[model samples]
Target: NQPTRVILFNKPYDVLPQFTDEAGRKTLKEFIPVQGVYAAGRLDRDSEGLLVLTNNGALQARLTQPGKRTGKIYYVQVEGIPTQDALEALRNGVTLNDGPTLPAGAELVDEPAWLWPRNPPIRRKSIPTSWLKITLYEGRNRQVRRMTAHVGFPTLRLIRYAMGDYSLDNLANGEWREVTD
Candidate 1:
């Protein structure tokens, strides 16, 4: 027996996390050379960042299943600079339409220097954008976007910088590598 095979992938914007897509939008097949693995967690088509792929089914469930507190960090760019009061609301948690969200770690952060510009870059003339480091434990569809928007700062760009112990590190856009242990 051996440790489960894992892959660290830096998914680019507009690329579907899965191998195939019906509409022919860019999918993982273009980048990932390895098989026998699937994404453990999902980073939405509009989102860009680290995507952990693994062959172990159990481990995938462990990461993606609800009720597990595997902290996921997102570097979110929002339309307006969030006030301390807004930050406090995030730390205390927001009441999304679905239900009340779990409290998470939140703080103001600078734009990541390593970020490569997006194809359709966020362009809002005059109105400034602010970066926020949000660590959310619950995985909901477009949760981060909803959270920031709920707090009066709509999310312009979102990136999942890390998940648990795995990170994107220096991985450029559209790069993938096996995790050796």
Candidate 2:
């Protein structure tokens, strides 16, 4: 059997999750030189942060499957500071349109000093903004954005800081590194 290959990628905002894009957009292919691996899950084109890619199908399923419960942590910048009640609600789990999410780890946090500026920064607004550290095991479509909005705090910027045991630490935008289990 082929050995499992894992890649931790620091995806930049505005880059497509897949290897190629027909619309002449930037994609993983421009950065990742290794072939045969595929992104285990996906990050939205507008979002940035850690993305795991793998050649091992079993490992891919383990990381992406909801039942596997691999926790994914995100550092979110929101348009407004979330109240204690809002943070508590997210910790207990919020009922999304699709269904109720599993209980998540959520808390207000200071803006990370190591955060790199985005090429096209998020729009500035007169209203105040705040940062949050949120962790969840489920991988629903745009779930973090939807959750924050549900609590009355729209996300301004989203970054996936860690996924399970792998992290984006030391990796810069559009950089990737191989990892061993």
Candidate 3:
């Protein structure tokens, strides 16, 4: 049988999905030493949080294939505090240039609920910012960032806290652990 490989990683911001970087930047190679494993889902190079990797191709397909209803949740720190109406708009669905997003589970939450200090930190401006917990049953490219922007609140920091049945938990940036279930 195969190694039954599965890993939960606390991927830091600015790291590429693939291990190798001919462009001379950080990538999964620095953190994940396991061989033959591929990412189940991708976190943008600019975003951070839980990233699941597995050696099982079938499992990866189940995690990433569209229409799977994987339910990814994000903690988004945006540029401004959204009004009740804006939050409702996000809950209902926000139309984007690509298409209208599926209705999401969104709620304003205290930033301290799951925040970890950023290493280099996001840029600061005079405008106040707020935190939101946004959960989606579908994973689309840049969906959380786009949804917040569409509702008139530009995101300053976006972190994926959980994906499907997994979460970051105690994992910290640049760390990984083998998982068995």
Candidate 4:
């Protein structure tokens, strides 16, 4: 068998992770010119950042399907500054509708200087928001959102910065690059 073809794409907000949309919503088809590979996992249309695509089904299953969960790192923008206790709770384990999540790598981080500007832009609420770096090992539906909300800091904007060893790494918004295993 041939080595799997891995494509790392930086997904922007409001774009669907899939290729086709009957409703004409923006999809990966517009950004990913190459064909055959499919997304290993999905990012909620509202969320942004690294999306791993591959041509091999086994590789896809490995990254997303049951067994040996992959680590996903997200830079979460929340409605308020996270207290040390909250961060600790997130790191320790926060229970959600599905179940308690494994101990995640959670910490407070200053807003990134090179952060991409959101096109629609976040609302200019009088209340402030803070940036947090949260790394999760399991991929449950909206787990990050649920986790932060459970800890009292509602997630405002979520950016999946990295997955396993693959990362955005200076990749411009709406850009893609091929990866070698």
Q: Who wins the lDDT comparison? A: 2
lDDT for position 159 in model 2: 98
Candidate 4 local lDDT, 47-145, one digit each (tens)? 999999888988787789865779999999998889999999999987787878898899899998769999888654688899999999898888898
Write model 3 residue lDDT over 1-181, tens digit each, in one string: 8867989998888887766564878878888876788789988888989899888988897889889888888899998899999999988988888888888888988885546788779866679989899999877778888888888999988899999889999887778888986
lDDT of 2 by residue, 1-181 (tens): 7878889899999998887555878889899987788888888889999999988888788788768989999999999889999999999988999999899999999999889999898865578989999999999989999999998999989999998888899999889999974
TM-score, cand. 2: 0.95
Model 1 residue pairs with clashes: none
lDDT, each prediction: 0.89, 0.90, 0.85, 0.88
Candidate 2: which stretches are off by over 4 Å?
none
- In candidate 1, how many Å is residue 166 off? 0.4
Over all chains combined, what TM-score does candidate 1 have? 0.95
Tens digits of per-residue lDDT for model 1 on 73-174? Answer: 999999989999999999997899899989998999888898899988975687999999999999988999999999999998999999978998989988
- Sort the candidates on TM-score, descending order: 2, 1, 3, 4
